[PDB]
Amino acid sequence: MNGTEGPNFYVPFSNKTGVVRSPFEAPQYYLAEPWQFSMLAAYMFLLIMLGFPINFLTLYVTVQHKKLRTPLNYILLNLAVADLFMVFGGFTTTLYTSLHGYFVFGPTGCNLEGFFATLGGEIALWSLVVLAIERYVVVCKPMSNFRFGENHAIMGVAFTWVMALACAAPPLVGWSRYIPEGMQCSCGIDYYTPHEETNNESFVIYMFVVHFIIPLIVIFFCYGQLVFTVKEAAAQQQESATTQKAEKEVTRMVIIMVIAFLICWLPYAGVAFYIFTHQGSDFGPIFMTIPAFFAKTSAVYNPVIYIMMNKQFRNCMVTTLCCGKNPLGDDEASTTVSKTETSQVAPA
Amino acid sequence: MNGTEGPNFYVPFSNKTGVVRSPFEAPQYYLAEPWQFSMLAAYMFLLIMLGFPINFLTLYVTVQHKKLRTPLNYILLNLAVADLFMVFGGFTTTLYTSLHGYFVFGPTGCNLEGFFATLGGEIALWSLVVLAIERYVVVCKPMSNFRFGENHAIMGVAFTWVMALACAAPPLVGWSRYIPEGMQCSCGIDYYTPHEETNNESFVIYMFVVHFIIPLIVIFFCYGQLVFTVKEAAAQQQESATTQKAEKEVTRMVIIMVIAFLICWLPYAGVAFYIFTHQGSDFGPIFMTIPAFFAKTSAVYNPVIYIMMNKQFRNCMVTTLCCGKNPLGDDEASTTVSKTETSQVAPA
Numbered sequence A, B: 001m002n003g004t005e006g007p008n009f010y011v012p013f014s015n016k017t018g019v020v021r022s023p024f025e026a027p028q029y030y031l032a033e034p035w036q037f038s039m040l041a042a043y044m045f046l047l048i049m050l051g052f053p054i055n056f057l058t059l060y061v062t063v064q065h066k067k068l069r070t071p072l073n074y075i076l077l078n079l080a081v082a083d084l085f086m087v088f089g090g091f092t093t094t095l096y097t098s099l100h101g102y103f104v105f106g107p108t109g110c111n112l113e114g115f116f117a118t119l120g121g122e123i124a125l126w127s128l129v130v131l132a133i134e135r136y137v138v139v140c141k142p143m144s145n146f147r148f149g150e151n152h153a154i155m156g157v158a159f160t161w162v163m164a165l166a167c168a169a170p171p172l173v174g175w176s177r178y179i180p181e182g183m184q185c186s187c188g189i190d191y192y193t194p195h196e197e198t199n200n201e202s203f204v205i206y207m208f209v210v211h212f213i214i215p216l217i218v219i220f221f222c223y224g225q226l227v228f229t230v231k232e233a234a235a236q237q238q239e240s241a242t243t244q245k246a247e248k249e250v251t252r253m254v255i256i257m258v259i260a261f262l263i264c265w266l267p268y269a270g271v272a273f274y275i276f277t278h279q280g281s282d283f284g285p286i287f288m289t290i291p292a293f294f295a296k297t298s299a300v301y302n303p304v305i306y307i308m309m310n311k312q313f314r315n316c317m318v319t320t321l322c323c324g325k326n327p328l329g330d331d332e333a334s335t336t337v338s339k340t341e342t343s344q345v346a347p348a
């Protein structure tokens, strides 16, 4: 056999030399140099040290500034929360695991690592549809007088979690399972074994369809609509109203946010689909480690896009960080937002 | 003319089309795509969001743990502090500047961005000599009963800032000057123009010798001395004493620290030396941008080497992060301590 299937796992290493051991019982240093595990460990350490502050800081700003309540502000507040979950929820285990070379917490550690990474990713993917829709509603404006309220945003948010819980919780209760991958320091869905006892093959299809191909079709199709109407071609002050101009900024970011999701997940999903369609073939530990641990950056790239592609949000942050206020930058040249300062309501 | 010299700058772009404008007065979007400035803008954001926690942590752990007071301990606290300066002193403006496309804060910002970036870089170069010496004094011990104590370290520390300020301060008071480089989003020493009115051509030769060639000669030399004695080969617990085998690791770190320094600064120094000897020649904005924004990682690669190459520091760190004790691991093995818990001394 090309690999060592265990009842709980599937090590991508032949056991001809009988040197293969359960990644829930002993170091996997026989799969790769030990330094490389340190590598992974130093990596998760840095990601945690970047992901915590960047996502908490986002969370804290969105709240503090009572005027940041656009559907986007809700969605990115939702992501920052999911990213904190990814950090303490699973990165903490994936760091611990890397340090020891194996899932010392056994299948639990594997479930924590895998669950939160999946939850993290699906919430992102599903938050992208909500943005794709919202963006469609304000650019191709399906209604004549429709305007999303905080209520609607709270809907989109609750939605992304129902969807995300949908494919990330089942593997905890019998439908498929989380199993170590690559060097065995991370956990993903089971694409490796057919394990009928838990219906692995049906769950992988369901997942690749309902939680990948469909959300992308929607996301890509919607874009084919905001091709004729609002286009990346953005100018200076006003564009058909400074309001229209600023509507163009949010869309650029939402597009960029997609490219960012794709870069971060196609490589993982790709290798995932490959194996699924080549179970038992001869692949090794590094095959899925690289995409797997690269995708963990998904826990931080969103807030950074937000802060670099949103004049408003960026300033509230400076306003927050500079304790008092004095939001240098260049403001939004438009509305602002905060708590005691200029969070003054400015309607009609 | 290949570039556009202003009385204050030197944009590496022709003004044949008359689209060139002072990097102190308007976006340089005509030098490179605006998405590229956002890319730099992001990059600095991450550096700031990583270099801050990691350097503050290094600082806080050293201070808090009493046994952490060897010469090395002294130096890397220095770095952690020089790094904190690079981040808040200069990175902050380079971030703001990149977000805007030019130095909205004019030459003050150029001086801020440039000064601190040099201060940091030079402090790190001199501290590599201090280490070079200390390493020599302990491996080729040309002394009889001379111990390189804290008093010496606090010396070699003040020393480094006296040298660093030596080349980092003059451009602020008439000798040479700081000026935008590459995409005009970071500042450096004037290698581009002769500006006799400020003696650029002399300050550069001074610098490339007093604060580059010399230090490197000494450091590369002190590496020659410890060629016969301590080497790269270091067995397990002990080699001629575990104390003799424990010093061979601080040496292997000091060497890695230098390798890292060279990778971070040779490219830049090189590009800089090339331009100084090809002023007016036809180079573009990306030419200096790539090496220039890469040497900025200088603000964070040190605390990383340290946490991965110094068992003692590492363990003391985890102790601090695990609040109380929970040293878990396998303890330093030799010495340990903290703020109070294991702070218990056992010297001589």
Ligand SMILES: *[C@@H]1O[C@H](CO)[C@@H](O[C@@H]2O[C@H](CO)[C@@H](O[C@@H]3O[C@H](CO)[C@@H](O)[C@H](O[C@@H]4O[C@H](CO)[C@@H](O)[C@H](O)[C@@H]4O)[C@@H]3O)[C@H](O)[C@H]2NC(C)=O)[C@H](O)[C@H]1NC(C)=O
Binding pocket: B004, B006, B015, B017, B018, B019, B020, B021, B022
């Ligand atoms: C590259 O080649 C360009 C084409 O020849 C050349 O264009 C000249 O650019 C300057 C500015 O860079 C123009 O002069 C400005 O004119 C405006 C009037 O619209 C003034 O407002 C401005 O001065 C003001 O001064 C105020 C007080 O100091 C200050 O508050 C304002 O902000 C502002 O600075 C300038 O006088 C000039 O008209 C342009 N000439 C032509 C024919 O277009 C570029 O200068 C040149 N770029 C280089 C060499 O860097």
Ligand SMILES: *[C@@H]1O[C@H](CO)[C@@H](O[C@@H]2O[C@H](CO)[C@@H](O[C@H]3O[C@H](CO)[C@@H](O)[C@H](O)[C@@H]3O)[C@H](O)[C@H]2NC(C)=O)[C@H](O)[C@H]1NC(C)=O
Binding pocket: A004, A005, A006, A015, A017, A018, A019, A020, A021, A022
């Ligand atoms: C790869 O081949 C290895 C050699 O055949 C094989 O090692 C075997 O590991 C089991 C662990 O389950 C050992 O069995 C021991 O199990 C418990 C210990 O927890 C106790 O009942 C006894 O100590 C018992 O011996 C086998 O002894 C050992 N066989 C050997 C080395 O001869 C691995 O299990 C294989 N890896 C796979 C397929 O997962």
Ligand SMILES: *[C@@H]1O[C@H](CO)[C@@H](O[C@@H]2O[C@H](CO)[C@@H](O)[C@H](O)[C@H]2NC(C)=O)[C@H](O)[C@H]1NC(C)=O
Binding pocket: A001, A002, A279, A280, A281, A282, A283
């Ligand atoms: C073990 O791995 C090898 C290589 O991945 C597999 O060999 C391939 O087998 C398929 C048929 O299943 C052929 O189409 C390929 O041409 C073979 N490639 C090579 C390099 O021989 C082998 O099938 C695997 N063993 C199993 C089934 O577990």
Ligand SMILES: *[C@@H]1O[C@H](CO)[C@@H](O[C@@H]2O[C@H](CO)[C@@H](O)[C@H](O)[C@H]2NC(C)=O)[C@H](O)[C@H]1NC(C)=O
Binding pocket: B001, B002, B279, B280, B281, B282, B283
């Ligand atoms: C403008 O830049 C060009 C390119 O760097 C310079 O042209 C070079 O000039 C040197 C000396 O005059 C020659 O040895 C090279 O062969 C030239 N490069 C080539 C092959 O084109 C030019 O000197 C610069 N001129 C200005 C305005 O300073």
Ligand SMILES: *C/C=C(C)/C=C/C=C(C)\C=C\C1=C(C)CCCC1(C)C
Binding pocket: A113, A114, A117, A118, A120, A121, A122, A125, A186, A187, A188, A189, A207, A208, A211, A212, A265, A268, A269, A272, A291, A292, A293, A295, A296
């Ligand atoms: C390090 C841990 C990782 C990368 C675990 C991920 C698990 C998992 C099942 C992820 C699935 C997917 C996404 C999230 C994004 C869309 C594509 C999927 C279905 C491959």
Ligand SMILES: *C/C=C(C)/C=C/C=C(C)\C=C\C1=C(C)CCCC1(C)C
Binding pocket: B113, B114, B117, B118, B120, B121, B122, B125, B186, B187, B188, B189, B207, B208, B211, B212, B265, B268, B269, B272, B291, B292, B293, B295, B296
């Ligand atoms: C982003 C800011 C940068 C790269 C500024 C650097 C400024 C400067 C004058 C640096 C000089 C040097 C060092 C520091 C290291 C050794 C080599 C020098 C002399 C090129």
Ligand SMILES: CCCCCCCS[C@@H]1O[C@H](CO)[C@@H](O)[C@H](O)[C@H]1O
Binding pocket: A266, A267, A268, A270, A271, A274, A282, A283, A284, A287
């Ligand atoms: C970026 C998307 C990546 C898509 C996944 C392509 C996997 S490709 C796969 O890799 C194996 C590694 O052992 C090779 O042995 C095999 O020949 C090759 O076809």
Ligand SMILES: CCCCCCCS[C@@H]1O[C@H](CO)[C@@H](O)[C@H](O)[C@H]1O
Binding pocket: A249, A252, A256, A304, A305, A306, A308, A309, A310, B034, B035, B036, B038, B039, B042
């Ligand atoms: C965090 C990575 C972001 C880098 C990707 C930039 C994509 S695009 C970039 O976005 C800026 C902010 O809205 C705009 O001002 C600018 O005009 C636009 O070209």
Ligand SMILES: CCCCCCCS[C@@H]1O[C@H](CO)[C@@H](O)[C@H](O)[C@H]1O
Binding pocket: B266, B267, B268, B270, B271, B274, B282, B283, B284, B287
């Ligand atoms: C170790 C890194 C040192 C880098 C110094 C090499 C500079 S190389 C120099 O660059 C000019 C501008 O692009 C070109 O026009 C020219 O042809 C090329 O030789």
Ligand SMILES: CCCCCCCS[C@@H]1O[C@H](CO)[C@@H](O)[C@H](O)[C@H]1O
Binding pocket: A045, A099, A100, B311, B314, B315, B318, B321, B329, B330, B331, B332
């Ligand atoms: C929480 C901060 C993360 C830094 C990681 C510290 C790894 S520390 C490492 O751990 C090994 C076994 O667990 C011990 O045997 C060894 O002595 C210890 O230095």
Ligand SMILES: *C(=O)CCCCCCCCCCCCCCC
Binding pocket: A321, A322, A323, A324, B081, B084, B085, B088
């Ligand atoms: C409210 O306005 C406080 C601002 C919050 C940002 C943090 C600013 C830190 C100040 C820089 C510290 C200099 C480093 C010194 C190291 C010894």
Ligand SMILES: *C(=O)CCCCCCCCCCCCCCC
Binding pocket: A052, A053, A054, A056, A057, A318, A321, A322, A323, B048, B052, B092
């Ligand atoms: C205003 O005073 C100038 C802005 C200075 C801000 C410096 C940026 C440092 C970012 C650190 C924030 C970390 C967030 C902490 C989360 C717990």
Ligand SMILES: *C(=O)CCCCCCCCCCCCCCC
Binding pocket: A045, A048, A049, A052, A092, B053, B054, B057, B321, B322, B323, B326
């Ligand atoms: C001990 O109690 C185990 C818990 C330690 C925390 C988990 C490791 C996270 C990586 C460190 C990043 C912390 C960021 C704050 C730096 C000042």
Ligand SMILES: *C(=O)CCCCCCCCCCCCCCC
Binding pocket: A084, A085, A088, A089, A092, B321, B322, B323, B324
């Ligand atoms: C002092 O000992 C405290 C160290 C910091 C605690 C970090 C320990 C990691 C535990 C996992 C995080 C809990 C899940 C929360 C998800 C939001």
Ligand SMILES: [Hg+2]
Binding pocket: A131, A132, A133, A135, A136, A219, A222, A223, A226
């Ligand atoms: Hg869309």
Ligand SMILES: [Hg+2]
Binding pocket: A260, A261, A263, A264, A265, A294, A295, A297, A298, A301
């Ligand atoms: Hg990514």
